[PDB]
Amino acid sequence: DIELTKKDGTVIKLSEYGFIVNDIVIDSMQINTKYQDKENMNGRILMGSNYISRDIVVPCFCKVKNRSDIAYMRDMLYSLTTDIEPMYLREIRRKEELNYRFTQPTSDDYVKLDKNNFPDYEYSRHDQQIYVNGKQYKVIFNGVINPKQKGNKVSFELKFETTELPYGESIGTSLELEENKKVGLWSFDFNIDWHAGGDKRKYTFENLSKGTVYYHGSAPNDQFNMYKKITIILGEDTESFVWNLTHAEIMKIEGIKLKAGDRIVYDSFRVYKNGVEISTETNISQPKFKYGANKFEFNQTVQKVQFDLKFYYK
Amino acid sequence: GNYSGEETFEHAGLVMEARSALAEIYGDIHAEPFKDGKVTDQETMDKELQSRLKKSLKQSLSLDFLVLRESYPEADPQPGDIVQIKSTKLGLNDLVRIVQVKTIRGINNVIVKQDVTLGEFNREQRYMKKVNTAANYVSGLNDVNLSNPSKAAENLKSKVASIAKSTLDLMSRTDLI
């Protein structure tokens, strides 16, 4: 219940700004269907079906000490939130409906009050809220009205909306999973084994014709807009270079001659032959990680493969 | 294509018929033959002929393009370039050339969308150019009379045959002397 927003150049959270929130409700993704009805047949063909948009709603109110200040506070809200600038929203929850604790009415152990006139139930460090999950959402704002209930309390009804892709982009790459350097950004929503360096954590293999990958993301990383990015030290010289993959298509690189120690950066629908001067004419096919086991099969025992990606959720 | 200007069918001048590779499965068809021609050599008569062939099995790909600015910016489409398209679930990975492009630019010269056509420019635009050529070639003339046309053409043609008859008379009368 804070509605964190990471904008291009800053980080903001509402309750820091005197802005309590009632709740956050996140719709699912609007499935746009594409059916076609045959003329006299009791059944209609599915041309397609496709996720579109994940409309968020967040009603937030605010109290202040005096009626004038309402105006300022409201303006702050707009200047703080209503941003066409695609932002990264992060949801927050509490772990408990906190109450005031027992005290002693002996002219001592009195109660605290926040900067806003409320009772601080958060006595200890471990009371305040948490990033409930290690993911974000690429988000933009839609119109709000501000009904002023009595006093200094005024409500607002934010209506956020997904920007590019209706998915729960996981923050942090898969290499931070590999190297346990960055802390946070890994919630139990992702069923992740502790065996760092073990299987289903590793995306850095060496000297293999074929290997195994566990894509922890329920949603499939077929869309190029996702940050799926591979880089391979090819290991062995060749004239052509095929690699296959399951839950995806076959990939070739024919017609250009390579060398062993040369490396390929295989970005989404894009191929850096040696990091620059992209040679992407050969078999334009992009790979697709669906969920769980995504087994790959090279053909000449690359001396290194490693690939970072982002986990996406539905 | 080498018979003289005054013959028109006594088919001297490199009589030949060619065909493409796909013929053998489709079979016997043929287009309007290369009747008009004053070209001597035979090297020409195969090039122009196969060009008349391969221009006709027409493929117009009037796809739509949508510009990505934050990503893939290095795709400013320009006409008369090579491009490698590939549509899955279509049976298509070949490369083609642009023949038409259609840009829009609101303000700051930022693009909003593109439209393009590949290979031949369209079926559509071919029809429309045909119509407009008809409608402008006509009304540029002056012989046209919508009420009973062909007086202007039949007067001419009958005059031509009449002078040919007079020329026949002259030929006989001169060969007499």
Contact list in B for residue A284 (CB cut-off 8 A) is 84, 86, 93
Q: How many Å apart are CA B95 and CA B83, to the nearest integer?
A: 6
Nearest CA-CA distance, residue B76 and chain A, Å: 16
Contact B88 A225 (CB under 8 A): no
Task: Tell me if A238 sits within 8 A of A232, measured CB to CB.
Answer: no
Question: CB within 8 A of A172, min separation 6: which ones?
Answer: A134, A182, A185, A186
Q: How many Å apart are CA A310 and CA A174, to the nearest integer?
A: 6
Task: Tell me if A86 sits within 8 A of A139, measured CB to CB.
Answer: yes
Q: What is the dihedral of CA A290, A291, A297, A303, to 10 degrees?
A: 110
Strand A263-267 relative to strand A229-233, pairing:
antiparallel
Q: How many Å apart are CA A313 and CA A221, to the nearest integer?
A: 10
Contact A284 B86 (CB under 8 A): yes
Q: How many Å apart are CA A33 and CA A38, to the nearest integer?
A: 16
Which of B71, B74, B81, B83 would you mutate first to test chain A, the one with the most A CBs within 10 A? B71
- Tell whether A225 lies on the interface with B, counting CB pairs under 8 A: yes
Nearest CA-CA distance, residue B69 and chain A, Å: 12
Q: How many Å apart are CA A259 and CA A69, to the nearest integer?
A: 68
- Tell whether A284 lies on the interface with B, counting CB pairs under 8 A: yes
Deposited experimental method: cryo-EM
Contact list in B for residue A283 (CB cut-off 8 A) is 93
Question: How does DSSP classify residue A17?
Answer: G
Contact list in B for residue A223 (CB cut-off 8 A) is none
Task: Tell me if A311 sits within 8 A of A290, measured CB to CB.
Answer: no
Nearest CA-CA distance, residue B25 and chain A, Å: 30
Q: How many Å apart are CA A174 and CA A311, to the nearest integer?
A: 8
Task: Tell me if A275 sits within 8 A of A263, measured CB to CB.
Answer: yes
CB atoms within 10 A of CB A87: 23
Task: Tell me if A111 sits within 8 A of A120, measured CB to CB.
Answer: yes
Strand order in the sheet with A25-37: A10-12, A4-7, A87-90, A137-142, A154-162, A44-62, A25-37
Contact B93 A249 (CB under 8 A): no
**Long-range pairs of B76-85 with CB within 8 A, sequence gap ≥ 24:** B77/B101, B77/B103, B77/B114, B77/B116, B83/B118, B84/A281, B84/A284, B85/B61, B85/B118
Q: How many Å apart are CA A86 and CA A4, to the nearest integer?
A: 14
Contact B86 A225 (CB under 8 A): no
**Chain A / chain B CB contacts < 8 angstroms:** 8
Q: What angle do CA B67, B69, B73 make, to 5 degrees?
A: 85
Task: Tell me if A169 sits within 8 A of A91, measured CB to CB.
Answer: no
Which of B84, B85, B89, B96 would you mutate first to test chain A, the one with the most A CBs within 10 A? B84
